[PDB]
Symmetry: D2
Subunit: 499 residues, 4 copies
Amino acid sequence: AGLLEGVIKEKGGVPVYPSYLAGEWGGSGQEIEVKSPIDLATIAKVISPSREEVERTLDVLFKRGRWSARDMPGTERLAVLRKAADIIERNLDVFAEVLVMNAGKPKSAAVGEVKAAVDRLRLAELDLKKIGGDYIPGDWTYDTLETEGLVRREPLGVVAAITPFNYPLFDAVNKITYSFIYGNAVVVKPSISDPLPAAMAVKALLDAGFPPDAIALLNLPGKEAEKIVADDRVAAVSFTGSTEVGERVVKVGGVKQYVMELGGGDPAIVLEDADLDLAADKIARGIYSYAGQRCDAIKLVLAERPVYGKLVEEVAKRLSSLRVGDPRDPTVDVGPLISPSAVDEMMAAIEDAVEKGGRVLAGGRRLGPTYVQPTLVEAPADRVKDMVLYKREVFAPVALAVEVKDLDQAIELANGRPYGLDAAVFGRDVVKIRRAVRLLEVGAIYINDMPRHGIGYYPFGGRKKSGVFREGIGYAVEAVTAYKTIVFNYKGKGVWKYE
Amino acid sequence: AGLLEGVIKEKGGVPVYPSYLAGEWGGSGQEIEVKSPIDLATIAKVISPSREEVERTLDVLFKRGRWSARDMPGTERLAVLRKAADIIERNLDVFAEVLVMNAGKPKSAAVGEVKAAVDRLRLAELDLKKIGGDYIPGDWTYDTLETEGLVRREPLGVVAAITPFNYPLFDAVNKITYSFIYGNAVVVKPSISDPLPAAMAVKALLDAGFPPDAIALLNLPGKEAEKIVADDRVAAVSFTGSTEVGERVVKVGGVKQYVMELGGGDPAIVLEDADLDLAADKIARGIYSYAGQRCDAIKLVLAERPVYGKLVEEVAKRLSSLRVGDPRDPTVDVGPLISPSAVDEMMAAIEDAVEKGGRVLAGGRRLGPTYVQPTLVEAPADRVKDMVLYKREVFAPVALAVEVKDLDQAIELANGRPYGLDAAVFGRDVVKIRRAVRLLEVGAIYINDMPRHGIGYYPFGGRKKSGVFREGIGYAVEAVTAYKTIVFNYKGKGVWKYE
Amino acid sequence: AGLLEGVIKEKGGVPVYPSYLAGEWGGSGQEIEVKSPIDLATIAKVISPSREEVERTLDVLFKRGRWSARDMPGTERLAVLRKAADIIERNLDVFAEVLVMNAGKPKSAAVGEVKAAVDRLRLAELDLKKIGGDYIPGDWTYDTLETEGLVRREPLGVVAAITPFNYPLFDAVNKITYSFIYGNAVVVKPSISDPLPAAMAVKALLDAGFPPDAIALLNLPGKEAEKIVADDRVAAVSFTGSTEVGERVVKVGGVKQYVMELGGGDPAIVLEDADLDLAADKIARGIYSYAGQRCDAIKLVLAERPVYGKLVEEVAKRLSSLRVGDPRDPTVDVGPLISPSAVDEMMAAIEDAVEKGGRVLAGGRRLGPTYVQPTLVEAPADRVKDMVLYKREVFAPVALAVEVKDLDQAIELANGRPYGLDAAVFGRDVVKIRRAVRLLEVGAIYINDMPRHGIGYYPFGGRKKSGVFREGIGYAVEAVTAYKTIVFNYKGKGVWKYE
Amino acid sequence: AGLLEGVIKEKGGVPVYPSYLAGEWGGSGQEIEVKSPIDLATIAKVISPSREEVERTLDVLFKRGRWSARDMPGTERLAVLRKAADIIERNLDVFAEVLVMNAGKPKSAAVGEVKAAVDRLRLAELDLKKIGGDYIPGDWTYDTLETEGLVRREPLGVVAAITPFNYPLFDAVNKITYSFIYGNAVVVKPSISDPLPAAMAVKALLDAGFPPDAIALLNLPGKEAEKIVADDRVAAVSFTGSTEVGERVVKVGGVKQYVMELGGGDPAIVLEDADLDLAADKIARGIYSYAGQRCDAIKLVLAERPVYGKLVEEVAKRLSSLRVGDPRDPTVDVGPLISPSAVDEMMAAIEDAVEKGGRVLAGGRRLGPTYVQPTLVEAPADRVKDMVLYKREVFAPVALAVEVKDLDQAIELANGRPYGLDAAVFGRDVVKIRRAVRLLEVGAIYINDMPRHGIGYYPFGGRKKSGVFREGIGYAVEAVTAYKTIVFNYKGKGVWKYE
Ligand SMILES: NC(=O)c1ccc[n+]([C@@H]2O[C@H](COP(=O)([O-])OP(=O)(O)OC[C@H]3O[C@@H](n4cnc5c(N)ncnc54)[C@H](OP(=O)(O)O)[C@@H]3O)[C@@H](O)[C@H]2O)c1
Ligand code: NA
Ligand code: NA
Ligand code: NA
Ligand code: NA
């Protein structure tokens, strides 16, 4: 709508969103329904591209898009991104409504994602802190004497941005931004679950001046996207999604540069000297935000004996006072999960915990096909490691609570999951904090706050099953750029006099 | 021998080299013959590890090796590497003899590789220019106000170093060095073709103090190594080899950090204003060194009309005056190719060129199962692109010569191969040079010199089919290390007064 | 005017500009006339502050201004600068008119300075590439084992910005920008000759939100400014002016951080392979722009035998076709010099050159008290070094032309002046260029272009008599900021296990 | 002796040390006695250079020394420094004996300084982390479009190293090392009080290969050194000494690059949660080491109410159990002060404190012309600020103890002195620590340890009266090096296609 007026076609029924084929919106492949977790109803359809159009798009992106993007000076590229931000911002409510509707995201969380996407675009100027190579004089070795080196980065070419359902707007804007600010062409592939926000952003970008042959948005479901990843014209693949899909992506792609943000949940550690008010408050929010559908959501809480009681009590109270329902009501604190399937898994995981010695301390009641209460399950340390909620990531509002004797047990348990994205530690003692910071095997540690990736003001990414490489203002240059080395030989030419 | 006295076991016949299993030398798997390209004779045997020993080694490297390496302070780790250099250096001739014998490398080139390996170890102190994270103050965004960030690198854990046959000693030492200087454990997997130099270096390292449970040397042939790459305890894979094997490696490994140095040959461009003496001299050497068995070997020469004649003439003269035979004779300029198979391919490729309009300008005569003359094949521009010598990398001393009308044709042809490792340009005009530097799609460009990776004083790596990521003093930190972000939240705590 | 309506007071006669005293505009000291080089007429008066007000201002800047500036978050500080840019830009013509009138600057050059000042403000976001300290792990020495370091920069406090007459608007905005973007308070002290543009910018900044107690503009003539430089509350002094005044400034200030941009002219070298059209064009402009009143103005031209003739001829033609007069006429190419005194010196210097063997090739005729023709004086190498035009900087449109036999003589002569700000070299041979780049003792070298500092997109500053330290986007952080080191001791505390 | 055999001349009596005149040892100026604080006896004489020899030395350093140093490749320069370290190390005892004798330094502290000097030389390889400029692409502004920049550092030329009496060997080696590793020539000017260690180091360097015309050691007393500082051939001045002398140095030198390490003492803050054992132990040592003759010595202790008692008690006990006397006895903990004059001042300062309400808690008794007891003087907060021991730096083993109500009072008092070199904070709460780190106006803060500059593994330097700029591995490059900018103009030349 609004910016998509000429694009969207209302074929008797729901609005139909076509793919962008690096030049023109279209698509001749199967049409696919897009539903809302609020009521399982169809709110639109997206046109997927035919194999022939995928092939043609890639050919355009490669043969022409790489140069449109690279040959547009940086000052112009940034102008494009700044303009795109302006457009998205004046269409805020429209962007947010689609998020609430398509993603089942509470109105406040939906507004937050639009603002993040706007800010990310505007702050592309900070990504520039990573522009500018290195000079390497040669007189520090006899073999390189009277030699000189210059190392600078160049865009790889065509970057494939694969996006998850839980941040349908931000992830797309984020990847497009860091790929473009450095001069790359981009193939965006959003979750078929909620691909509407991505189409809206791509249009805003095109309206803002983004080289028409340098970007693409293909509505391809799951494995049909493999055609893109495996293509040799795709020099990089920026993927945010599940460990399991990420694995398949690399196996299909083969040699290329990758950024793999594979989530998993995060553990939170509470030391005896922690401000329990802050802790309880932050931990509770970390558990339920967006119905736990945040890769940086808290899935396990670990607290030392002397504060475990209060802490768990306060968090349980907090989770209990939450209001569930339709996200539209700014009254509601928690909306629905992306699918009934996801709730099924959460219920099963809660049963498993109880059978293995676990006790629910708050929530636990399913309220509908896609509605559930944010849950907090207590578990004894000697039994938690075998619980599904521990061993795996149950993408839902549910966390385990475990009493520990000391920091070492806290750390050990925190590290015992197969993931290593972020971790949180509340407490005040520098030494204990330092210890934790060194031994927690995660990409990021939040001291006295819940894990919050934000727009990547601070880089993030995983360790272990949570992936490889980071995303962040500036740091993302490593995934979409390659080094170029220039060596000059002046031996005997008289520049230097033996040196 | 010497440092391998207690290790090597002479079971009636040839010396038998066991694998190092992160603690003790051994192996209960098939024994494999190691032959010399000088006379196809068996010079030794290596003991491959059983699946059970591979499993056990990885378990040691992971559970214990990661910590031995990480918990050894850096000052101590560097001492180890410096010591290892001392040991290899006093055993120079021994190391070189094995290179000449096992790799068919001319005595001078063999001495050069030992010296490179010694220097690489000693210069691990320069890799330290990449130690030391980033501080990120939070007041440049309202959402991060009263927040702070610290980003530092940590070793990934266990790094798998897969090595090629043409630099059997250097590549191994190089990878072990940058992996260890940053605190990682390493599984070295040398080419089964010439795994002896690697065993010698590993022993020197162990003798020097390298944590015994933090390193491994497994004599596994080709695909049996996949067991290592695919294992989850292997967090990184540093691979130097062929495009085709590299592809398989990533597909087997899945998500992990990779450095893929996939070679291919390099093109050399000669402008009308180039010093043709230097050019001819450097280009000829770039063509024949180590019998063209250098990933950075020149495979194509492009020269502007007015100098093509002289240039090709001078290079042909030079290639013609070379002496072939056994590498032992410091008289010989060119030894044998690693296998008769490699020569077969070179002969076939030369035929193909001639059939497609090509004419030999020097060499072309096979001198034995593993001996051939360094060849220079002339080809008209309108026909070279379909020639096997162009489309592929014929790992042998053979290059195509092509006359071009101008720099644009030179660049176009240079970029027309599927590889993009390095490229060379001889000439003096800044503008033409700048143009070439911008448009040549390669990891590195050598101005007025032949492509020479050396010890990585200047980083190198490929573009296109030549791979992803770089190796170099300092730059290699990106492949064996991961970022750790620490975010501190001081909101309302009184550190800052609104700012 | 416009933004200065409430500020400027028209006391029967000319407009009277008061000083800004870190809180309120005012001043109780002598009033001073401000004249225009276009007609020696008084166009305004500035109120200088009393010793008591200087003292009070410094006390405010120190006790309160340092914190207003430091405690304003960066995101807010940048907003202030961006806003200030908007204000100056909408008042462009007003800013430019005052420049043309007060500085005698040609309308186009005046518009250029306003745009530079606007751009400099807007690009303060690029100065941020220099925000963010260093982490220093301690295990690379035994004595620092189990220790850790963090190094970050902090604003020094109160920065004194002393400004020259030739870039009355830019220099002021530039210094205020880099001092403020990092959190410092600023005392601006413009040339009493043309202090009006500075007052206009300061007002725009105050209007934009600049903490009122964190900035000051004092109309103090020459030596009366010493009171500021010598004060201990002034932690830094950013000075752009003459070598001789800079010398006095440091001697008065004593220990503090300084940036000393002391100008002098620049030499231009033309090699035999240079595009003489470009060369002649750029060199001529470098000679006459703003009537040679540019610190980066060309004062000496050196060309190799074979091109000297044409080059000097083309430049002479060009200088000859220039139109002199009042700057207002967009027809005029050259306006007046800041004072008749400056012309006196130029005429004397031209006489000296001729007496010492020099011959005028273009210009030489004085056209009025403050008007002169852009001059080009030929001089034989064996006699040029004793000429006033060589030994000194004659701030006027005049340069020496000298034929040389080769690059070495060119370089030698270029380096023979007491200054070392910038230098220019036209030619195409990489080796000769490299040679020149290494041996020219200057802060900056321009290849195939005239020296052009611009807004400091590329850092600049001098060597020898041209000063110390640089100014530039990002690089200026060194002059207004100080390092803070934080060392943490964890010995025996259990963070590390021997390492 | 030993390495000074041919140099030192025993003219009937004490050994006579000549100055090194950039080529040959000598000197025709007044001879000066060098005495030992252990017994006020003359242990040697140094030959000062005549004005004519100073002039000649500078001329050599400038005309020839700059190039010997710059034209010696870095790999060779480092070899020189590594060799010099070897020589000093094998002559350890000799170096230490002279320190104990000439500086009155306890044998252990003397051995420590020799080891520091050895390590500093060997670690010059870590200074290399600061070698290698910046590439600046031009397409981020329209005015710099099709332009490019390269910024690299060059040695300034001739660096003057002025050294203090308390670290007669280290400071000299330190300054020579960072000046030389980057390619500068050096004029060393040691304290006339104890210039012997410097002569020994210079000889070791000359023996190690240091270009003979690139270094100088001039035995000039106080103000006679001004001749050096004021000379235009001296491009940099690295000075470690008193605030007052530093001030004079800059006023004499004028415009040049300076590093001013002006000391003053340091304050130590003890929070209620601090390990009082560690605190007391570190604080006591910080008070008495080298008889308080350390610029980083503790002069003021501030502890929160609840721990003040114990803390002061434990420190008093510790200071009391110290043994004073001749430094030779490894039994002695404290040797003499450099002169009786220094003790006079300490006694006067202790009287002043008592008169103003202060009470001695330990020590206070003078034991001889140059011997005193390490003292701890208690003072009430409401009266300490007017005490001489607070307002000034009494270079002796004496500190004030002051009870405070909270961190804010601690910080306020800590910041109340005119100095700002380092500061120490003992405690464990992150927030309180963070607060202190932000508000303490010093160049460096030591958390849970006494201020210890060491060899500059972590950079240090002052704020306020303690100076400007830092010294440290790597960081010192800023004081002895200058930037060189190279801008390339390719406008319309066809490198870029509009970008
Ligand atoms: N890019 C660079 O910087 C660079 C540098 C040097 C060389 N190279 C290139 O690399 C090649 C080196 O020669 P090469 O003939 O030895 O090539 P290669 O066969 O590709 O070398 C492969 C290395 O990988 C191992 N390997 C083979 N199959 C494997 C599998 N399925 N799984 C895991 N590991 C496997 C090999 O062991 P086995 O010996 O047991 O098969 C060998 O150690 C050349 O093409 C050269 O151009 C590139
Ligand atoms: Na692939
Ligand atoms: Na895998
Ligand atoms: Na002063
Ligand atoms: Na001076």
